[PDB]
């Protein structure tokens, strides 16, 4: 059966995070946990925390046997954007967007 | 007596967009382009309804000319001979016979050749 965990309003742009998520699409849990540890990106920490939390859910709420779980679906999508002001030359001013993201991982024993 | 234009405009816009399914790019997502695409498409359809009746006659003429030269006669002489024998077969039917029945086509051809005499 399926089990889900979500990180909402993660402080990172959606485009950057999606690069990490491509690696672990459709692998086994152990291999994914290995790959995320030895990749040097800020996003890799967030995805790994989410994946570990999802693993924990599938054992304590649902059944067991973490030894054959797989990553079935994973996707990222944009969240609300904060706006801020940054000055420029000659009195002009510019807009700044601080984008966020939502993180979901689908782990199942199929 | 104030009237708001929400539902009416929304329905009118949705009517046009549903007519533009399968169009590339923004030509199927934004109204200002879908409108022009649909108007064009209507114009082209109206124009093509006249052209369709010409392409098929073109094709039939080609096929009849091909089949006639197999039996040692040109298309123009064949057609002229058919009328001197007072035979009224539609060109579409002649092409169909040429494709699907060679014996019948030869039966017509020899008669036309005799009509020319």
């Amino acid at each position: 059966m399926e089990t889900i965990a979500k990180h909402r309003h993660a402080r990172s742009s959606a485009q950057k995070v999606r690069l990490v998520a491509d690696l672990i699409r459709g692998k086994k849990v152990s291999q994914a946990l290995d790959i995320l540890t030895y990749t040097n990106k800020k996003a890799a920490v967030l995805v790994k925390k989410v994946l570990e939390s999802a693993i924990a859910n599938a054992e304590h709420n649902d059944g067991a046997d973490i030894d054959d779980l797989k990553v079935t679906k994973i996707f990222v999508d944009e969240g609300p954007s904060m706006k801020r002001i940054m000055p420029r030359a000659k009195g002009r001013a510019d807009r700044i967007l601080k984008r966020t993201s939502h993180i979901t991982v689908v782990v199942s024993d199929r | 007596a104030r009237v708001k234009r929400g539902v009416i405009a929304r329905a009118r816009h949705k009517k046009i967009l549903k007519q533009a399914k399968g169009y590339y790019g923004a030509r199927s997502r934004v109204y200002r382009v879908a409108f022009q695409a649909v108007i064009k498409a209507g114009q082209y359809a109206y124009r093509d309804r006249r052209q369709r009746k010409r392409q098929f006659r073109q094709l039939w003429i080609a096929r009849i000319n091909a089949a006639a030269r197999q039996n040692g006669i040109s298309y123009s002489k064949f057609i002229n001979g058919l009328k001197k024998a007072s035979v009224e077969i539609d060109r579409k039917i002649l092409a169909d016979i040429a494709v699907f029945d060679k014996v019948a086509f030869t039966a017509l051809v020899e008669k036309a050749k005799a009509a020319l005499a």
Partner: protein
């Protein structure tokens, strides 16, 4: 210089076709402790090529 017509969402995708990154696959096991590490790097508990090292 600026663009005259905004590029499509297709051209944006085509350019990004080389932005995908790669995994490692070069995971090695230590002789003695048996834990994982990269090639030519010391493991987490200070074990290189079986023989114990600094391990602070």
């Amino acid at each position: 210089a600026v663009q005259q017509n905004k590029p499509t969402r297709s051209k944006r995708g085509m350019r990004r076709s080389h932005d995908a990154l790669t995994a490692v696959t070069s995971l090695s096991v230590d002789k003695t402790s048996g834990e994982k590490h990269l090639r030519h790097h010391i493991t987490a508990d200070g074990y290189y090529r079986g023989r114990k090292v600094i391990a602070k």
